[PDB]
Design a protein around this ligand. Structure first.
Ligand SMILES: COC[C@H]1O[C@@H](OC[C@@H]2COCCO2)[C@H](NC(C)=O)[C@@H](O)[C@@H]1O
Length: 514
């Protein structure tokens, strides 16, 4: 695909991927690059930095404030008042001023922008955070946290109960709790009233409370999380903690009867001798249609239609894709169509894995379901490719240096036989070092480097009251924390479907090392 032919396709991640391929091979000239912004679906990350080696953007500054950016720390007192206030939106700029000018500006702004005044005078002290915390300036607090994460201080009950009202609070709480940073902030957040938080914030504050062995406060946070969470899966995670902490048997019962299939509801079913949830069975009699499952542009198109279809239009697409050849698209449509109420665990291109042992089949399928929902031409925002969502670098190393496939191209990852084969091969390497399918999942998504670093710590996946569940809440990258939970549920299910059942309790026991 030449740049001219790509330009005649709709904007999409696939079109981006292919533009990126031209760029990394140095095939986009300065002239081709001129009209190219408008041809990129998602102008973020690698494709942006690559295009910018060819055509910098010096942008962007609002024509109105242009003259404000002609001043520096040394001339800011010569600027009009509007220009003065615009420049003071940057804490680095404020930090750069000398203290006499911070004093002068603080007076200028006392009446109309006391927020600026507080930051100006704060930077005249040796601890600006302490000054801001004494004023209980909430906006100031978050601006300082965003400026530097190194500030750490005890916060009293009144102040910490004000933080949750700011949009920055949820990321602030999450970051410092899962990174184990800012201990004085963390300890202080024990005194946040559960009434003042909800949803993810409440949940993280429950995890925080467990790390300090405040199990009652933890129960109260998790219970507020349970009552406010929008998604049933997250609600289940909170109900699980409520149960582990207090062992009210109504909590476990509610979790065992959840409509969401996840590790918590599966475990609850197993603890209460409740039957395994019903898994749908999709077996279309019709064998093929016109659709090319190997065309990534056709997937981007159909995917957009499916996501924008009303309750009614799905039914038309369901019927059209009700074939063996488009099984992955059928199940994808059905999953949306039934508003996530039914459980679909398909096994497409099964011939390519039927000779592996069943445990290996389940792990493969478990990864694929989460990675791509088995869409052969799936492309991620980082341009991970195919059913098993290989990054190009690893695909080329396996494809070219290890397996030496003749005329290998990274787009071979779009073929099911290749995806399953490379997945099997990579999963072999991970399993041999890590053993648990959870740990393999973490390493598959996040790399074996971060997984090995997490498992070398003395406070992760070791023995303890609430292990291994607590450790699973403190996995330091959000995407990997989530990924491992979802893939582990998938794994349990597929082991069951393949008549190679395991108790999820056995999985959890083998996460604790000594
Ligand atoms: C937390 O999981 C990380 C993986 O998420 C996948 O996204 C899930 C999607 C949602 O859309 C339908 C298919 O499943 C990513 N896959 C894609 C195509 O973006 C995957 O790359 C990522 O590792």
């Amino acid at each position: 695909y030449s740049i001219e032919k790509l330009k005649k396709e709709e904007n999409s991640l696939a079109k981006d991927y292919y533009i990126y391929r031209l760029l990394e091979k140095n095939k986009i000239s300065k002239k081709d690059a001129q009209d190219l912004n408008s041809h990129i679906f998602r102008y973020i990350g690698k494709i942006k930095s690559e295009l910018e080696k060819i055509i910098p953007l010096k942008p962007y500054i609002n024509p109105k404030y242009a003259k404000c950016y002609t001043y520096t720390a040394n001339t800011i007192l010569d600027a009009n008042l509007t220009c003065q206030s615009v420049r003071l939106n940057s804490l680095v700029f404020i930090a750069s001023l000398n203290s006499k000018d911070r004093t002068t500006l603080a007076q200028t702004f006392k009446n109309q922008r006391p927020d600026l005044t507080n930051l100006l005078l704060a930077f005249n002290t040796s601890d600006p955070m302490s000054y801001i915390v004494q004023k209980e300036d909430i906006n100031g607090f978050f601006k300082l946290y965003n400026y530097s994460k190194k500030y750490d201080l005890d916060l009293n009950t009144s102040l910490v109960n004000k933080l949750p009202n700011h949009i920055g609070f949820k990321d602030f709480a999450q970051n410092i709790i899962i990174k184990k940073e800012n201990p004085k902030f963390r300890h202080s957040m024990l005194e946040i009233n559960p009434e003042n938080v909800s949803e993810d914030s409440a949940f993280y504050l429950g995890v925080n409370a467990l790390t300090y062995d405040k199990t009652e406060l933890a129960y109260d946070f998790f219970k507020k999380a349970a009552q406010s969470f929008k998604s049933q899966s997250n609600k289940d995670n909170a109900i699980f903690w409520m149960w582990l902490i207090k062992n009210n048997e109504e909590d476990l019962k509610t979790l065992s009867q959840s409509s969401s299939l996840n590790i918590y509801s599966l475990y609850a079913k197993e603890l209460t001798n409740t039957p395994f949830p019903k898994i749908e069975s999709l077996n279309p009699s019709k064998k093929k249609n016109n659709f090319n499952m190997q065309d990534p542009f056709a997937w981007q198109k159909i995917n957009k239609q499916i996501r924008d279809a009303n309750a009614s239009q799905l039914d038309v697409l369901a019927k059209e894709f009700d074939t063996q050849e488009t099984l992955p698209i059928y199940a994808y449509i059905l999953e949306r169509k039934n508003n996530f109420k039914k459980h679909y665990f398909i096994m497409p291109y099964y011939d390519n894995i039927k000779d592996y042992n069943k445990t290996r089949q389940a792990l493969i399928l478990a990864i694929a379901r989460q990675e791509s929902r088995f869409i052969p031409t799936a492309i991620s925002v980082s341009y991970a490719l195919g059913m098993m969502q290989f990054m190009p670098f690893l695909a080329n190393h396996i494809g070219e240096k290890e397996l030496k496939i003749p005329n290998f191209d990274q787009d071979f990852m779009f073929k099911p036989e290749i995806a399953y084969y490379f997945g099997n091969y990579h999963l072999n390497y991970l399993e041999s070092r890590l053993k648990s399918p959870l740990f393999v999942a973490y390493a598959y998504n996040g790399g074996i480097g971060f997984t090995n670093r997490m498992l070398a710590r003395n406070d992760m996946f070791k023995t303890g009251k609430f292990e291994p569940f607590l450790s699973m809440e403190l996995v330091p990258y959000q995407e990997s924390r989530i990924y491992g939970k979802k893939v582990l549920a998938n794994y349990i299910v597929y082991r069951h479907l393949l008549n190679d059942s395991i108790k999820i309790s056995d999985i959890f026991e083998n996460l604790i090392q000594n």
